From a paper:
Here, we present crystal structures of IiPLR1 from Isatis indigotica and pinoresinol reductases (PrRs) AtPrR1 and AtPrR2 from Arabidopsis thaliana, in the apo, substrate-bound and product-bound states. The crystal structures were captured in the apo, substrate-bound and/or product-bound forms. Each structure contains a head-to-tail homodimer, and the catalytic pocket comprises structural elements from both monomers. β4 loop covers the top of the pocket, and residue 98 from the loop governs catalytic specificity.
Known exceptions are Arabidopsis thaliana reductases that have substrate preference for pinoresinol, but only weak (AtPrR1) or no activity (AtPrR2) toward lariciresinol and are thus named pinoresinol reductases (PrRs). Within the twisted loop, His93 and His97 “grasp” helices α5 and α10, while Val92 and Phe94 interact directly with (+)-pinoresinol; Arg95 strongly interacts with NADP+ as well as each of the GXXGXXG motif and α2-helix from neighboring protomer of the dimer. Similar conformational changes of β2 loop and α10-helix can be seen by comparing the structure of AtPrR1_NAP_ + PIN with that of AtPrR1_NAP and the structure of AtPrR2_NAP_ + PIN with that of AtPrR2_apo. Although Val46 is unchanged in AtPrR2, the α2-helix and β2 loop from the neighboring protomer move closer to the substrate upon its entry at the catalytic site, further condensing the pocket.
Author numbering:
A (entry chain A), B (entry chain A): 6 to 317
């Protein structure tokens, strides 16, 4: 007995998307994944979808170029979760979600939509410079379309994926931690929020039918993972029994020559500046009633000493 | 007691490469995987490498742009297996292997090199037209460099990956089988050789220290998977209890307008022409002493009715 929750994951072969599919299956949701014809001859995408089908997910054919196919897909479910791309060095197709919003509005049966958020809260980032500002402006365009359409929502925000900021000791251009030398942004004593991307997906699956988070922004701030960069580096130094040689990088030097860099690097520099120099993930307080680890305390989130162990 | 085999897989995060890593671990080889700095911020590549490390593989840092780093990597092992890219719609970087050949020659300790073959035997394909001919010409350039350097080798050839030709009933542009209508090349009665890409990797791990295949071409021809396209379609019709509407495509119509197509499609058309119209995978006899399933009869290769089941 009890209400059934059917979930359509749009973006199910993405980095976060594939973890959201797994987490929805594990949570017991009836889990559907969009199978786009445009994935074409991409063997990794196709075989990810088949792997979900083996685990009990339902593949639903549809294309963002075919409005009625999107309407037909979302009519099958109660909740839609979008994990649309939003990283300049990957692809950055956040605005394609406008077509999904229009399909949800027409279908009328969707109880909640979670758009592709899962990072810095775009509503706090009006000051950002281009091209990094595209991430926040495009995500706000989706939020505005959600509001105009009257679609119920949850926005899950507020943490750095450990893959991109934690396992590499926040060194740009690599996802492996350095062996001898490390660049520290500023004095390294600005608190950053880290979360295992797997746990971001677990909180997605927990929150998407939680009445407490209807039409709310939910902040992901795992207490033990609120760490300065120096604290993160010290976790690694303990695991490896070795001190790294530290270079402290001023804000002025961090941003030097930014106009001459590749677009995706300019975006990265801007995001890193907000996180590590401005402390944008920790410069505001949030209540327990809107923070993921307090709402879902049964998720035993991965701490960064555990995340880092496989790298040593 | 007995000789230890250390294997370096170069290309370990590739479609075939990741399966070769898995198969080498399963075979009991001491398994090393090249970790290139150029993989950069690619989370899927990095996390594949870490997944191998969790299973007991050894990550070895090196770059094709750093000759001495390649020499140092290959000095650690007895056998090198390259799964370098070679598909126009993915990347086609076969010639980068020349740098690996030079490093192997200098190192001097490598007992065998398996270059990135794993498809049509390039030595049989001199007649191919550009741009598809690039695949065969570039692979022959590697073979010629191997011979000039005196490096011992095995060339594993002769079968279509089920992912690209079997699970889709050989329909171009998709990896899913069609629901109602199917295009048949010619009369559909030309034998093609199909192999699960997983089993191509198993035969790689079996053959790379087999004295019987030293300096040999080894053909992968699983008897139950030597199928015409009509036979493949009939397997699917049986699984789905439904007949597909067949359109028979002449060679002339298959190649029509080829000069106006995108390069990667022109390459695909050429390869499909050799396989399905010329029967290039079955127009020559091979001996049991050079055929993978007879050499390694303990590999219970996947048949195409099993491969197709997850699609219905
Ligand atoms: N540290 C942090 O907090 C981070 C936050 N993020 C945020 O996470 C979210 C997801 O990012 P990520 O996982 O990297 O996304 P990916 O780059 O993996 O792309 C996700 C999905 O987007 C779909 N997609 C891309 N282009 C199109 C298109 N033109 N039309 C239709 N679908 C398309 C695809 O779906 P399909 O599977 O159907 O092919 C793809 O798998 C973003 O909002 C991002 O900003 C991401 C990185 C780090
Ligand atoms: N039906 C059949 O028989 C088929 C046969 N094949 C053949 O299989 C082989 C592998 O193909 P596939 O698995 O699709 O390959 P992928 O496209 O997956 O690429 C394999 C690896 O190539 C490496 N690579 C690519 N570019 C470079 C570069 N510039 N420098 C260094 N390394 C690079 C990468 O290694 P890293 O992991 O280190 O990043 C990558 O993971 C090819 O020879 C292909 O022709 C492939 C398709 C079907
Ligand atoms: C933390 O919030 C976000 C993070 C991100 C990050 O995903 C990966 C990118 C982007 C910001 O900086 C990351 C990055 C960019 C360039 C690099 O060289 C890099 O190296 C690790 C890492 C995107 C959107 C967000 O709201
Ligand atoms: C079978 O031998 C090979 C096959 C291949 C194939 O890998 C994928 C490509 C290429 C030939 O045709 C495949 C392909 C190309 C275009 C398509 O639209 C397609 O759809 C399934 C499939 C490459 C090298 C080979 O020696």
């Amino acid at each position: 007995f009890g209400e059934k929750t059917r979930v359509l994951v749009v973006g199910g072969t993405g980095s976060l998307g594939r973890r959201i599919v797994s987490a929805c299956l594990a949570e017991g949701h009836e889990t559907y994944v969009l199978q786009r014809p445009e994935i074409g001859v991409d063997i990794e995408k196709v075989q990810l979808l088949l792997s979900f089908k083996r685990l009990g997910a339902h593949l639903v054919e549809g294309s963002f170029s075919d409005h009625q196919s999107l309407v037909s897909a979302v009519k099958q479910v109660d909740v839609v979760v979008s994990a649309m791309s939003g990283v300049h060095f990957r692809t950055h197709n956040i605005p394609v979600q406008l077509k999904l919003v229009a399909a949800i509005k027409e279908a009328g049966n969707v109880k909640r939509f979670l758009p592709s958020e899962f990072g810095m809260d775009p509503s706090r980032m009006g000051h950002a410079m281009p091209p990094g500002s595209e991430t926040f402006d495009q995500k706000m365009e989706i939020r505005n379309a959600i509001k105009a359409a009257g679609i119920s929502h949850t926005y899950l925000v507020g943490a750095c994926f450990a893959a991109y900021f934690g396992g590499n000791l926040s060194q740009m251009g690599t996802l492996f931690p350095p062996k001898n030398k490390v660049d520290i942004y500023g004095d390294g004593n600005v608190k950053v929020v880290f979360v295992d991307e797997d746990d971001m997906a677990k909180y997605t699956a927990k929150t998407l039918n939680d009445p407490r988070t209807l039409n709310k922004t939910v902040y992901v701030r795992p207490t033990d993972n609120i760490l300065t960069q120096m604290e993160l580096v010290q976790i690694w130094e303990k695991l490896t029994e070795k001190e790294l040689e530290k270079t402290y990088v001023s804000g002025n030097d961090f941003l030097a020559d930014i106009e001459d860099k590749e677009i995706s690097h300019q975006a990265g520099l801007g995001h890193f500046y907000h996180i590590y120099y401005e402390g944008c993930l920790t410069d505001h307080e949030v209540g327990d009633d809107e923070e993921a680890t307090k709402l879902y305390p049964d998720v035993k989130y991965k701490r960064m000493d555990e995340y880092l162990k496989i790298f040593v």
